[PDB]
Amino acid sequence: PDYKFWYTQPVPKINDEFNESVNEPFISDNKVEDVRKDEYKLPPGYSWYVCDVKDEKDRSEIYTLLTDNYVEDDDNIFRFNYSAEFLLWALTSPNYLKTWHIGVKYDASNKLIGFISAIPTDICIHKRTIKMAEVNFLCVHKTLRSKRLAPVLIKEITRRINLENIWQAIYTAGVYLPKPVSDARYYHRSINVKKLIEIGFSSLNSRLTMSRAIKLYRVEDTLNIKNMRLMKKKDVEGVHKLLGSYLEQFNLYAVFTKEEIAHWFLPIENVIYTYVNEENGKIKDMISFYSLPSQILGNDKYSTLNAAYSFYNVTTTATFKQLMQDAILLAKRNNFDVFNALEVMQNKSVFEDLKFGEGDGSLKYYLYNWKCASFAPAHVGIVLL
Numbered sequence: 034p035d036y037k038f039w040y041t042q043p044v045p046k047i048n049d050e051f052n053e054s055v056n057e058p059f060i061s062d063n064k065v066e067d068v069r070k071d072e073y074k075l076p077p078g079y080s081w082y083v084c085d086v087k088d089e090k091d092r093s094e095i096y097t098l099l100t101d102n103y104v105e106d107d108d109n110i111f112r113f114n115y116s117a118e119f120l121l122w123a124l125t126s127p128n129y130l131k132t133w134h135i136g137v138k139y140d141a142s143n144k145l146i147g148f149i150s151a152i153p154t155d156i157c158i159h160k161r162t163i164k165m166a167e168v169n170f171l172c173v174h175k176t177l178r179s180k181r182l183a184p185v186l187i188k189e190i191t192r193r194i195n196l197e198n199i200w201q202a203i204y205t206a207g208v209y210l211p212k213p214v215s216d217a218r219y220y221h222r223s224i225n226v227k228k229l230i231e232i233g234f235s236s237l238n239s240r241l242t243m244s245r246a247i248k249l250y251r252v253e254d255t256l257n258i259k260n261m262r263l264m265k266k267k268d269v270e271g272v273h274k275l276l277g278s279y280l281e282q283f284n285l286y287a288v289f290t291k292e293e294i295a296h297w298f299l300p301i302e303n304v305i306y307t308y309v310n311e312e313n314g315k316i317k318d319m320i321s322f323y324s325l326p327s328q329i330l331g332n333d334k335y336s337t338l339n340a341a342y343s344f345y346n347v348t349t350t351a352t353f354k355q356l357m358q359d360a361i362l363l364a365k366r367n368n369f370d371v372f373n374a375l376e377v378m379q380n381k382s383v384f385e386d387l388k389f390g391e392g393d394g395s396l397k398y399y400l401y402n403w404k405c406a407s408f409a410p411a412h413v414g415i416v417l418l
């Protein structure tokens with residue numbers, strides 16, 4: 034309603050809208066020399082802490098903070114449980130900066146109570162490519178909510194990003210803020226349907242008995258693209274071409290270098306899965322999904338929902354439906370309970386046929402210090418972790 038913090042920031046007002054001829058910063062001609070060199074003031078008893086995510090102990094402190102205090106679903110039934118190895122992968126992409134991994138400690142206990150992170154990436158927005166920061170993993174301890182700590186974290190990481198002569202950022206949130214460039218509902222494809230029913234993720238009715246639900250979501254254990262196999266280092270050049278060509282159609286996407294392709298797609302158990310179809314030495318199809326479990330709050334039988342999240346998928350030798358059918362199958366083969374996807378890129382066109390259910394909310398895409406026309410989520414070509 035009031036947006037007292039966000040209306041001090043270079044972002045659109047709630048009722049602002051720009052036509053497609055507008056694609057530029059709110060504030061231009063920024064000078065690194067004029068950026069503040071002092072850290073933002075914290076309340077007494079709290080201090081900034083630079084986290085070394087490559088140090089197991091520092092990384093474990095971040096892991097604990099998020100496990101206990103990060104995103105929950107709208108009904109406080111699930112809480113994200115990013116693994117420590119996932120956080121390593123998500124935060125140490127090519128040319129990342131340690132000083133963009135910012136913690137807040139409570140001095141008396143020496144314990145982390147706040148975190149925010151960014152990584153650098155080239156972002157193409159309406160065909161214009163801008164060096165940006167991708168902001169993620171903003172988290173304040175549950176006991177310290179609504180004390181205006183989040184604006185301090187946001188202003189401090191803004192300052193540190195500006196020190197590197199970067200003046201734009203991309204971020205996503207479930208909360209509505211000024212002002213989304215796009216808004217994407219999420220959908221869920223049941224794989225282990227008995228577990229999903231028992232934990233309250235899915236439901237039954239008189240027409241859909243347990244046995245009927247299990248049969249509805251049963252899948253054939255045979256791939257439409259028979260040679261889909263785990264990506265290897267030799268495939269980096271081919272994935273770079275296949276995905277890079279595909280993404281140029283969208284209004285918002287990351288312009289991956291080959292080093293970034295290797296980092297974001299080479300498979301890591303329980304973190305990132307990429308499968309490729311190689312034909313005549315060329316990569317002609319790819320499937321990828323990442324592992325993001327949710328802790329199941331207060332369930333005595335199951336502690337974790339094992340969820341695969343659709344990442345980037347491209348096909349040239351099958352239909353997109355056939356490709357995403359294989360994606361579901363590959364997630365099932367890797368013991369995931371549910372396959373989750375946003376209505377971005379071509380995804381929505383397969384949701385009905387492949388038996389996805391609509392979820393309870395949406396993920397909003399935002400840019401910082403950029404004015405441009407908004408667009409439908411099918412024009413979004415980027416997925417943030």
Ligand SMILES: CCCCCCCCCCCCCC(=O)SCCNC(=O)CCNC(=O)[C@H](O)C(C)(C)COP(=O)(O)OP(=O)(O)OC[C@H]1O[C@@H](n2cnc3c(N)ncnc32)[C@H](O)[C@@H]1OP(=O)(O)O
Nearest residue numbers: 036037038039170171172173178179180181182183200202
């Ligand atoms: C050039 C470089 C620029 C770099 C920066 C680019 C921007 C990056 C922006 C960050 C991108 C994050 C990407 C992700 O990580 S999205 C993941 C967000 N994390 C969670 O949801 C975890 C669980 N919740 C929490 O930890 C806290 O509730 C957080 C920390 C989220 C808010 O803490 P708290 O609830 O204790 O609130 P407060 O009293 O301190 O602060 C209230 C103010 O903060 C605004 N708020 C609330 N939630 C969010 C949110 N998710 N993005 C942006 N702003 C948010 C809110 O509208 C209000 O402002 P205004 O309404 O009064 O104006």
Ligand SMILES: Cc1nn(C)c(C)c1CCOc1c(-c2ccc3c(c2)c(CN(C)C)nn3C)ccc(F)c1F
Nearest residue numbers: 104105106111112113207219220327373374375417418
């Ligand atoms: C399961 C589950 N367990 N928990 C704890 C939730 C919230 C869910 C729903 C997940 O919804 C998503 C999200 C999705 C939706 C909201 C999100 C997120 C992802 C993120 C993480 N990144 C993108 C910032 N933050 N927020 C607020 C992104 C892509 C999807 F395909 C989803 F199904």
Ligand SMILES: [Cl-]
Nearest residue numbers: 041073185188
């Ligand atoms: Cl200020």
